[PDB]
Each structure stands twice: as C-alpha cells, then as structure tokens.
Amino acid sequence: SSHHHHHSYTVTVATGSQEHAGTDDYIYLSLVGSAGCSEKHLLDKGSFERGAVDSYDVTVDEELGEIQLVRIEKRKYGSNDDWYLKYITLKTPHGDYIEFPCYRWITGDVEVVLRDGRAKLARDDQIHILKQHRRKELETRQKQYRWMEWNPGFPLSIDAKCHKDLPRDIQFDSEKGVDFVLNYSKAMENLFINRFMHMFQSSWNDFADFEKIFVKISNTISERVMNHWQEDLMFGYQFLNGANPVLIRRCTELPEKLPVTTEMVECSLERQLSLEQEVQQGNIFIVDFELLDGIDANKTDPCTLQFLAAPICLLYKNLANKIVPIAIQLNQIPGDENPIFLPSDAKYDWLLAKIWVRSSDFHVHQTITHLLRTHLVSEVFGIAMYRQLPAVHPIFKLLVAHVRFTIAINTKAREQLICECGLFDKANATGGGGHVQMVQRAMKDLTYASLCFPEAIKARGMESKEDIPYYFYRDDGLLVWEAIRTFTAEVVDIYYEGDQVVEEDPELQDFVNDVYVYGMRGRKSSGFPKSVKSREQLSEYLTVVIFTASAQHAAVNFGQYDWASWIPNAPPTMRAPPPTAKGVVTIEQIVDTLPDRGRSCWHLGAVWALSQFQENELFLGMYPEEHFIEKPVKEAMARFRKNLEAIVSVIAERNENLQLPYYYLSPDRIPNSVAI
Numbered sequence: 001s002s003h004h005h006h007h008s009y010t011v012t013v014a015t016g017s018q019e020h021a022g023t024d025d026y027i028y029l030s031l032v033g034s035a036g037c038s039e040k041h042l043l044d045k046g047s048f049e050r051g052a053v054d055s056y057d058v059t060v061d062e063e064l065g066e067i068q069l070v071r072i073e074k075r076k077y078g079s080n081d082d083w084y085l086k087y088i089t090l091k092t093p094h095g096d097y098i099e100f101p102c103y104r105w106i107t108g109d110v111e112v113v114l115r116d117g118r119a120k121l122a123r124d125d126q127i128h129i130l131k132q133h134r135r136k137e138l139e140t141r142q143k144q145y146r147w148m149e150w151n152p153g154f155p156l157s158i159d160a161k162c163h164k165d166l167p168r169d170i171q172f173d174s175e176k177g178v179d180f181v182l183n184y185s186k187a188m189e190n191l192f193i194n195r196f197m198h199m200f201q202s203s204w205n206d207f208a209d210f211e212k213i214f215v216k217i218s219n220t221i222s223e224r225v226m227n228h229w230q231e232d233l234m235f236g237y238q239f240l241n242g243a244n245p246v247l248i249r250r251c252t253e254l255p256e257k258l259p260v261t262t263e264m265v266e267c268s269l270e271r272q273l274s275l276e277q278e279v280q281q282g283n284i285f286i287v288d289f290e291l292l293d294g295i296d297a298n299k300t301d302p303c304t305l306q307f308l309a310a311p312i313c314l315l316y317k318n319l320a321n322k323i324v325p326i327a328i329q330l331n332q333i334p335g336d337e338n339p340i341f342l343p344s345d346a347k348y349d350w351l352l353a354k355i356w357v358r359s360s361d362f363h364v365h366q367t368i369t370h371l372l373r374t375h376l377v378s379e380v381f382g383i384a385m386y387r388q389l390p391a392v393h394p395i396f397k398l399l400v401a402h403v404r405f406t407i408a409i410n411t412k413a414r415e416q417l418i419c420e421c422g423l424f425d426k427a428n429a430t431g432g433g434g435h436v437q438m439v440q441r442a443m444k445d446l447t448y449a450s451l452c453f454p455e456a457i458k459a460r461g462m463e464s465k466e467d468i469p470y471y472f473y474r475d476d477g478l479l480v481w482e483a484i485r486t487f488t489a490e491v492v493d494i495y496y497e498g499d500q501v502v503e504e505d506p507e508l509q510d511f512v513n514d515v516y517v518y519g520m521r522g523r524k525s526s527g528f529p530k531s532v533k534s535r536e537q538l539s540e541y542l543t544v545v546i547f548t549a550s551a552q553h554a555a556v557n558f559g560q561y562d563w564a565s566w567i568p569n570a571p572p573t574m575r576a577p578p579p580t581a582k583g584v585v586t587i588e589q590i591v592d593t594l595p596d597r598g599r600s601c602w603h604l605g606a607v608w609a610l611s612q613f614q615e616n617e618l619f620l621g622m623y624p625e626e627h628f629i630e631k632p633v634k635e636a637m638a639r640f641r642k643n644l645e646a647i648v649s650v651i652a653e654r655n656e657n658l659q660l661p662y663y664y665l666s667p668d669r670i671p672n673s674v675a676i
C-alpha cells in the first residue's frame, strides 16, 4: 500500500478506503509557515489509489519556520475524480513530526487548507495566519451548510432538496450507498415476498396464510412473537423492552377520561386492593396516545380506507412484578360507542383491542420516537456543529464521528421515504400527511430535559429498580448514558481550564445558539440552553448529543424487525375502524382489518432494511478517523472503550438469565451515529 517518491520535508498523504476515494487528477501542495509560504509543488503525477499512502521528498526554496497550515489543490486530469483525503503528515527539516487531520472529499471546486491536529479554541490563536484561516473557514461553512424549513413547525434541517445537492463532505460514500428505494425492494426479494409488492387489495386468507410466508423469514425474537403475541405478558413486556419502550409511565391517579372501576378489573387485581388503592401503591401504569387523537388517516388509496385510534391502555404490576394490560379504551373521549375492553371480554374483543394499541404504538414509534426524536434532533446538532465549530475545535473533533451520515440519511428520507407520495405512504396509516401532523404536535413538547436520559426515566416514574425490576431498556440506558457522561466530562476537562473558558468560547456559544434558535425554532418551552457557561453543563450537553445519536437511536431502531415483522403485533395500518361494541368481532374480521398482502410486504421490507448493520459499521467508541491526535484525549477515549467493554459484559451476564435477551443497548451493537 505504501509508495515512497524520492526527489527537505517528508510529506505523507493517506487516501481513503471508500470505493471512490482514489483520484487520477493533479495534486498540488504548499506549506504555510510563520516565516513564509512555500511554492506550489505538484505531487506524484500518477494516481492516488483507494487505501494508498504516498510519501514525497519536498525541497523548499526558503526557510519557512514552524508549519501552521497545509494547502491542497486538485486540478483536473481528464474527467472529475473526487478524492478522499484522510490526512497529511510532515517530517520537517528540523525533525518535527506534524499530523494534519482532513477526512474530507476534495473536489476540484476549491483549495483545502488544514490545521495541525492539536485541538485549539479560538482563544489559543493569536497570530493572523491562524485567526484568518479559522474565520474564513467558518464563513465558508456557513455558506455551505444552511438551515431550511422542510415542513411547517419541523425542526430546521439542511438546505438541500435531495442527497446529491449536499456538500460532498456529508454525502454517503456512494450515491446509492444507503437508499430507501433500492434497499426496500432488495429487502423484499431476500425475504421472498417480492410477488406481493402490489397486492394492495388482497387480504391474507387467515393467520395460517401469513404464517406460511413468515416462518421462512423469521428470526429468534420475531418467532417468539409469532408464538406468544396473544399473551398479556408479551403485550405488556414490549412497553419496557420492545422496540419502543419510552411511552409507559407510572400512574399517580386515574384520568377522568377513563372511567374504569375496581369492579371492571377486579379479576386482574391480585392484592385484594381496590383499583384506586392499587394506583396509590404505585402498581398501576398507563400508556396514553392522545397524540394520535385528530391525526388524519391515510387516504392516498381511495380503494382502501385506513384507520387510526388514540387508545388509553391501563396496565398492572402483578404479584410476579410483571406489567400486564387490565383495561383498554381505544379512543380518548369516554362513551357508549367507545367501550373499555378488558381481559375478561370475549376472546377476540380483548385481542383486537390489544392489536389496536400495538398498531398505535407503532405509529408513535415510527414518527415521534424514531424520526423526530433521534433522526431530526441529531441533524440539528450536526448542522449546528458544521456551521459554528471549525475542524480544529475539540468539540468538532468529538462530535463529527457521532453525526456521520446523519444529514445524508435524513435527506435521503425526505427525498424518498417521508415526502409526499414517498414509500412511507404505502403501508402506514399515518402516511399522507398524518405523520407530518404528529411531528408538528410532538415538537410543541420536545424538551431538552426529555433528552436527558436519567431525568426522562424519572419524569415517567419508572426509575425505581426495586419496584419495577424488569426494565432492561432503563437499566442498560443508564449504564451507557453514564459511560458517555464520563467520557465527555473528561474531554471537556482537558481543553477547558474552567467554567469561564467555557462561557467565553464564542464558537461554542454560537453552536449552542444555532441549535436553540434554528434547530428548535427558538421556542422558549424547549428548555434548550441558549448558552453554556460551565464545564458540567457542557458535559451534559455533549452527552445529550452523543447518546441521542448512538444509544437512543440504536435502542429504538434495531429492534424493528424483531418485534414488528410479525405484523399482528405491529400493524402499520388498520382497514376497519376500532370496534364500537362488544360481542361482535370475529377472527375473520380481524384478518380483514389487518393489512393486506401488499402493505404487509412493504412493511416487512422496510423494517428489515432499517434493522440492518452495514458490513463495516462503526460501533460506539470506534474512532478510526483520528481528528484527535493528542495523548491525553486518546487515553480518555481508551478509558471510554474499556468502560463500554465492561457494560457489554454486565449486559451479557444479565441476558443469560432472561427468557428473551435485551441487547439493543449492548455497546458493541450501538452505532456511533444515526446512519440508517
């Protein structure tokens, strides 16, 4: 891989490993020293190949002094061949070894100028050569990465209509690297359900019929779901350890909108206490989908009426400390045509009620828990980072690894998936505009506190490990959150002497302020910091960014196929309205209410595709791109990895004793960033 060119400085250039990293164009390189610049030297003449490391002997016509910058220029040879430059190092005449991190695509469009890898705050740069580069870099970043309102009331996002319009730096490594159109269809072929992709009018004949298709493609967990999805235990299990375990909260008093009585649920209670007394003991929990109330159902297919509920599900921590459903009201306003279903009802009344709650859980999962609260939020942090933090800034170096491909995957999504007439309209009952309504309404109550994991759990009354023992999403989440809190606190303490340095960092303040004003639209009730004025506050802020982008997203993303592939346990749509009376529903009707073959197929394709890890996935703590090069921060990273390794073992041992292991938050399965 290593090609040395001998005719001074020794200039090493490392090309990227990506498919199209190589270039065959001319590469000129000059050195900017305190005592003066150098000449523009052409390099190689040949080709810089994928994975290559080329070094050169470069003799200069005058003494340059200490090297401050390195300029790179790509002039065309034949056609335009993009070039991914990982980094450049120098062995100077005086024997110094200097590394210049890059990790950028170099299209001929403009000269690329690099700092040496030591992270510097603005206050560290007092000479004109550095200050000018720093200021000019931010000017360029702010012309290149702009905010834009994609839909009314959304967090602001990148100013680009489609993926190819993005700056090359933040695009996927290929144009079809991660593609919703391509990956969904390929998914459907590998699941052998390709023939169903347009059967939007054909119901399954029965559960045996869908099951015929499903046994061929089930995995460990979804097969468990196939065999146990009708059980109250599995139903309640998912609110804690399923694909979307963030909605349930301890009920401190029954809502007036749910007129449920002790008599109605006496058969479920097991401590000889009334329902009301049970609530006061802290044994009653609730999942309430008031958000779905008023959301427009998908009408893009005039031949299929699709339907949404907005249920209130009451649950109960029984004597075995398992949480189970004891009552379900499918809509918000109590009444005669809005029955409170119970486990003591006819078999299929209770089953269908649970199916509607599972379907509602799915809608809120897709759009709010997943899209808004990890994807869109992570893009807000990413854009603000690019706009306000130069590459030499320690916080840029820290965060860039954790917003990798985030803007790219989100732009792909707005281009193909969630736009008008996107893939999302095919199977989802909220498709066609409802999902946009959900984001707008959830946005009004998206807060900074709700992204702080420990507080969020506490706010939902689910913090007690003693009272609520089997909340594995909570337990593991807390371990990983604390591991990140530890790592960010350490990095902050290295580069910030005190709280006053944090407060006076104008680029940090502008980063935080962009997130607040543009990202979060300047809504006062968002609770986001307008500024950050202590190392402790900065540490927490950075943990919010990193945790949301890695752990939180992993928790709510990679369990989609496990739990949703068996469709009756996560219907993306319902083709009949919720039952208004008891004693009417039949199993045949349920099969016709569940999604047809066409929507089942697009649903399966989607949840499989989104749950895949890429071959060379970068998991939490893996930083192959060395933006940081200093010993102290490198050791902080090493401690981060060891701390994470310990968590992997804690979680593994914990899982050996579980009927159904929970591993979405095992750090070795948590990607660095939102990339799918």
Ligand SMILES: [Fe+2]
Residues within 6 Å of the ligand: 370, 375, 553, 557, 674, 675, 676
């Ligand atoms: Fe995702």
